[PDB]
Amino acid sequence: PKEPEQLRKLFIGGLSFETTDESLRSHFEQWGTLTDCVVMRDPNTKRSRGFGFVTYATVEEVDAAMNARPHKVDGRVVEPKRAHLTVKKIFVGGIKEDTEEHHLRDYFEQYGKIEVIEIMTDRGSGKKRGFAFVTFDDHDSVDKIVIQKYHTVNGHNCEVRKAL
Numbered sequence: 123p124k125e126p127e128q129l130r131k132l133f134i135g136g137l138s139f140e141t142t143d144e145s146l147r148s149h150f151e152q153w154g155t156l157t158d159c160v161v162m163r164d165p166n167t168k169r170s171r172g173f174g175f176v177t178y179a180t181v182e183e184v185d186a187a188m189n190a191r192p193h194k195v196d197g198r199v200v201e202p203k204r205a206h207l208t209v210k211k212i213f214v215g216g217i218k219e220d221t222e223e224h225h226l227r228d229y230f231e232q233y234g235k236i237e238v239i240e241i242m243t244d245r246g247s248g249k250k251r252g253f254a255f256v257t258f259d260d261h262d263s264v265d266k267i268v269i270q271k272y273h274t275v276n277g278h279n280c281e282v283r284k285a286l
């Protein structure tokens with residue numbers, strides 16, 4: 123059936139205070155069907171809080187919207203994020219001693235543009251320790267990676283988390 127609603131949402135920060143439900147929707151409907159679109163407002167003044175959210179029908183639509191950044195909405199470049207600890211680096215554990223840089227590259231390059239691959243080695247012996255760090259040029263790669271239940275790299279079932 124339908125992917126969980128939480129995984130179909132984009133929070134949108136940095137809105138122009140003149141953006142409305144209607145103008146935010148007209149913008150983001152370019153990349154898919156929107157089931158919901160709200161600008162957050164003060165309950166008493168109705169003045170914009172400067173952020174909102176949109177909900178797409180599918181995760182592929184969320185991907186399309188993030189691939190179309192930067193978004194200029196009503197004259198202002200906004201900041202869309204998936205459902206925040208916003209980082210560009212992941213820890214990859216469980217890769218043992220036989221996983222190479224090209225294994226990590228070939229797998230993770232389909233999530234985002236890779237800038238650094240660091241396979242960790244023992245400070246004394248030089249032996250591989252069984253984990254690595256991958257740095258991307260942008261946070262959405264990481265956000266897509268860490269919501270997956272599973273990552274299989276070089277036949278290993280890997281543990282992947284955000285790295286600070």
Ligand SMILES: CCNc1ccc(C)nn1
Nearest residue numbers: 223227236237238239240
């Ligand atoms: C040690 C390998 N480092 C990297 C960095 C970036 C890319 C794309 N591939 N490999």
